Amino acid sequence: ERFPAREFQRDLLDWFARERRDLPWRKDRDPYKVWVSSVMLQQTRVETVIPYFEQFIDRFPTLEALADADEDEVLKAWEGLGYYSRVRNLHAAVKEVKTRYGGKVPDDPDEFSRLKGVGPYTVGAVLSLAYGVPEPAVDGNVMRVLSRLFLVTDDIAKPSTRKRFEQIVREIMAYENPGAFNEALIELGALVCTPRRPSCLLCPVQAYCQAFAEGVAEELPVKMKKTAVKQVPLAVAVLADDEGRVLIRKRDSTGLLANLWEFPSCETADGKEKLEQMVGEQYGLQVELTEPIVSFEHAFSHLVWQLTVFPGRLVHGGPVEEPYRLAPEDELKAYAFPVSHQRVWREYKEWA
DNA sequence: AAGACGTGGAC
DNA sequence: GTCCAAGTCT
Numbered sequence A: 001e002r003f004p005a006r007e008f009q010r011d012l013l014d015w016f017a018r019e020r021r022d023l024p025w026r027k028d029r030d031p032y033k034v035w036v037s038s039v040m041l042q043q044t045r046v047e048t049v050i051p052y053f054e055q056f057i058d059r060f061p062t063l064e065a066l067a068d069a070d071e072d073e074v075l076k077a078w079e080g081l082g083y084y085s086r087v088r089n090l091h092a093a094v095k096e097v098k099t100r101y102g103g104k105v106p107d108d109p110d111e112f113s114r115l116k117g118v119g120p121y122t123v124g125a126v127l128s129l130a131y132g133v134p135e136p137a138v139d140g141n142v143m144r145v146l147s148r149l150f151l152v153t154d155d156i157a158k159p160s161t162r163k164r165f166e167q168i169v170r171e172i173m174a175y176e177n178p179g180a181f182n183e184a185l186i187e188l189g190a191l192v193c194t195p196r197r198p199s200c201l202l203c204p205v206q207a208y209c210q211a212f213a214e215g216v217a218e219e220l221p222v223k224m225k226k227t228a229v230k231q232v233p234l235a236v237a238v239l240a241d242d243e244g245r246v247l248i249r250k251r252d253s254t255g256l257l258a259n260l261w262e263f264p265s266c267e268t269a270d271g272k273e274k275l276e277q278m279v280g281e282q283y284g285l286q287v288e289l290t291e292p293i294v295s296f297e298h299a300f301s302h303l304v305w306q307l308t309v310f311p312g313r314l315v316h317g318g319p320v321e322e323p324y325r326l327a328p329e330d331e332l333k334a335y336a337f338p339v340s341h342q343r344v345w346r347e348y349k350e351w352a
Numbered sequence B: 001a002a003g004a005c006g007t008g009g010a011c
Numbered sequence C: 001g002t003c004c005a006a007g008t009c010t
């Protein structure tokens, strides 16, 4: 009630007009391209995402293009970006738009939000940017800026807190330009109101900041500490044959690293025993392995893989039954692999 | 709800 | 080495 919204809006939107970064998705306001950027940015950094966006749109320039495309090429476009469920959900959602909504991204929040991958941030980011809808796009940058502006001491993970934020944004938003107001809060947490050592003396909205006044900015926002993750020992065989082809396999449609290709992998601490028993269980397949060559960790949010690579060679009497395949070295670059098994191949290739 | 779900920028 | 990124599934 004592907050000068209109003055806060003049200062934020002037700063934004000067200091807004030139990013590939800011060249226009196509609902599709905003949506694609919003999804790619989820838990991924702007610098990390820039080259991906440029390549994705080249392969898939329109909503209709991504929907007519095969799930395999859609995934190879996301290769290395992580959280790969976003792209299977984004691909499924663009199909629903083509059918039910006639290739026009919905502009009703509740219809858009009913598409897969579209949550409260994606709803705000697409509808406000491309359609002028005044829906808050409350991401990690906004929570940190708002918790500092308004001294929100509560865990930003709580639904009550996320409601407080949504309501703050509805009060203070500039309904003249919902998009730029939403995009400017983000840019401010990205370039000024940073997590560690914020640039408060370089901030256009320092006068309106309550955490600046009390000198508690560094203590906010309030997020929980990560509890240790499980460590998962993994044995990986890079098997070749006399023709040079490498044995690979595709992972399940459901689970971790779904529908990605990997080298045969097993639980573990003998390893060389558990891996031969597995490849030998395939029809017409005989394996003799060597001594390991590298052992590296690969981190996930929820767990950490402790990988160990065992080189070797393979003799197959006949056709390698799916899910396995034999692929020349030249042709590994076509399949989509997780970053962990991209490393597995580097450490095997330099080992020669 | 709680946890599953990838990776690396930026210090 | 540590945090968390323009978060979402259900």
Ligand code: SF4
Binding pocket: A145, A148, A149, A192, A193, A194, A198, A199, A200, A201, A203, A204, A205, A206, A209, A210, A211, A212, A217
């Ligand atoms: S004054 Fe400091 S803490 Fe407050 S919004 Fe600006 S950068 Fe963030």
Ligand SMILES: [Ca+2]
Binding pocket: A112, A113, A114, A115, A118, A119, A120
């Ligand atoms: Ca939703």
Ligand SMILES: [Ca+2]
Binding pocket: A252, A253, A254, A255
């Ligand atoms: Ca599975």
